[PDB]
């Protein structure tokens, strides 16, 4: 397969020492979790418990994610991404690491978030509202980008908004990277739904782009009230719902422009499909939320070719902003 | 000790949001370094380190003040006082606040100016240079006292001047303070020779009218070409410098007036000392910057009580600002 490398922040984590970047020797300072008292369950997940909490030397409302003890490296790099990436803009801020005496259980410890109900927003987004949190959303990745680092989870579980003080939050930073140019990274991450194609056809020298790739998702399913936009039932399917909408000639220019292999299991399924119109997905149910400005940026967002999509930066630039 | 309160923007905070002076609540967003290489050093106080800088994504001149992590209250008031006055006339401006990615150093980023320095100044202002800089002063300080701030360490060098382009800013933000009416300040602050009487005798309840202090000491140095005007080797003999111009029986009134108890180790060094006439620092080497009102203004800035001076709005009506 043919190489390749980001258009933006190529070289950040080169020009910089091996500290920065080096997770696996970087040294945790565990706190002691008597510091904080539990207060209720919040979430839950991928190897993980997140609950309430006060600080009982401040009295301060924070958020404890009790973490299930999975690979020692994963809990570094979170770790060492939230600590280089703490006081950025829209980041999750992590305001301690700490341990239960007893249990022995690894903890982070987070800024308290009045997370709105995703439900609940996608009722009452108004077209004003989208540009604004896609806006605060593309701040937090542009940030991020220039810090070398791939979030790699980018879907709307993992931005927590706080409706009634219009704050928004990048949280799970579980499955994030360090960008270093030519390296081949796993293609297991990301939910599905949110996927890029590069990760459906096993390319593995990806950049921030896949994250680009993920935030068109997200703006798709809100503008045309369509969640998720791309179905998949499946990890091979997902690739054949992209295929469905983008079309399977411009899906060959890709694989052929990188010289990728496909997977015997796909020709069975994929099929032929003709590129979509995005007007087509114009409905009375979404129109209020739909502009020519909307679907221009977000043919930009969702195209095969990773290096063709527009970067966070570019992103911002967009005229689909100018009203914010 | 008798209570006190400021004569002008008493209660401008009282009446203003929690948001605008907590600013232990505030959430500050640090950028990346990244856009900024440093030139060289400028200066290096007890808190930073001062760098001239080129923001490398539109090639502009910039201040990058490099603090050094001393307590996180300090660098957040900092921050907010800058972001609350940001805009302000002739109050250096914040551009940005960012974080060197690898050493994760906070540090401030400032528009540049091209100071003129204290020597080279103090040899070459006219009279006219004088009242102009002063009044330049005077607008920053009225500004920053309406926005119910004190900036505490008012001197010459936390003045920039741009003699060339007749520019002038206020900076060294780091000591400034919300002034909340009936609070008891540290009066461990401004610098030996520009502290006023009030953090001398130990008076908490001291208001902006500190900041007019300071100015005094400043004008006091120019027009007599005598720096510091008040030249003391300690906290004990900057009073008794003070006493032996102003006088002692002034010194005891206004002690009296707000029942200050005095240190028992100023016995044996305070003395009894006649109020000197302004007249009496004339010489042949600045006769050519004194004149009658420059004296009538100095006497009404450089008073014991911190109620009888004038106050930056007053101080610009007077007859020494004629000219300008
Ligand atoms: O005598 P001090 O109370 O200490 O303070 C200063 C200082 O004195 P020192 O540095 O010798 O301690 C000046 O000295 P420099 O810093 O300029 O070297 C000195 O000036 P000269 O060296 O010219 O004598 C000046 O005295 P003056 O301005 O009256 O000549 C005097 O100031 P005070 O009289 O205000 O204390
Ligand atoms: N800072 C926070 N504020 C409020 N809720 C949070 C916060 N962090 C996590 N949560 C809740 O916990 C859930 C899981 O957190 P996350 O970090 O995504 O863990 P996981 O990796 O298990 O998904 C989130 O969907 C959210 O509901
Ligand atoms: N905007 C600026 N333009 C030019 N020089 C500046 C500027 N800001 C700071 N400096 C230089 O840096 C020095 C120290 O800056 P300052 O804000 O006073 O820091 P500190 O509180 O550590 O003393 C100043 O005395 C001046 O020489
Ligand atoms: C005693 O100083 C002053 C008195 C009156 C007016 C201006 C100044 C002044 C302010 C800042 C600088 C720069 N370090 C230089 C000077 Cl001369
Ligand atoms: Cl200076
Ligand atoms: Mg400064
Ligand atoms: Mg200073």
């Known amino acids: ?148 680092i791939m979030h790699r989870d980018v879907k709307p579980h993992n931005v927590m908004i706080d409706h009634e003080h219009r704050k928004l939050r990048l949280i799970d930073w579980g499955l994030a990277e360090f960008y270093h140019p030519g390296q081949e990274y796993n293609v297991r991450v990301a939910s599905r739904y949110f996927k890029g194609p590069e990760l459906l056809v096993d390319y593995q020298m990806y950049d921030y782009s896949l994250d680009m790739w993920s935030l068109g998702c997200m703006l798709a399913s809100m503008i045309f009230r369509k969640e998720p936009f791309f179905h998949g039932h499946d990890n091979y399917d997902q690739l054949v719902r992209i295929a469905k909408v983008l079309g399977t000639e411009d899906l060959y220019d890709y694989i052929d422009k990188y010289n990728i292999e496909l997977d015997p299991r796909f020709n069975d399924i994929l099929g032929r499909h003709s590129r979509k119109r995005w007007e087509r997905f114009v409905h009375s149910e979404n129109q209020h939320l739909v502009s020519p400005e909307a679907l221009d940026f977000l043919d930009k967002l969702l195209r095969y070719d990773h290096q063709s999509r527009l970067t966070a930066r570019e992103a911002m630039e967009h005229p689909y902003f100018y009203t914010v």
């Open 1 to 148: 397969p043919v190489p390749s490398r980001a258009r933006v922040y190529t070289d950040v984590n080169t020009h910089r020492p091996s500290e920065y970047w080096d997770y696996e020797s970087h040294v945790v300072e565990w706190g002691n979790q008597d510091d904080y008292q539990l207060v209720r369950k919040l979430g839950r997940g991928k190897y993980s418990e997140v609950f309430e909490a006060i600080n009982i030397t401040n009295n301060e409302k924070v958020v404890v994610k009790i973490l299930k003890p999975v690979k020692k490296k994963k809990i570094k790099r979170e770790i060492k991404i939230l600590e280089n990436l703490r006081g950025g803009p829209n980041i999750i801020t992590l305001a301690d690491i700490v341990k239960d005496p007893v249990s022995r259980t690894p903890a982070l410890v987070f800024e308290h978030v009045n997370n709105t109900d995703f439900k609940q927003l996608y009722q009452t987004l108004t077209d004003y509202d989208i540009r604004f949190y896609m806006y605060e959303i593309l701040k937090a990745l542009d940030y991020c980008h220039s810090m070398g």
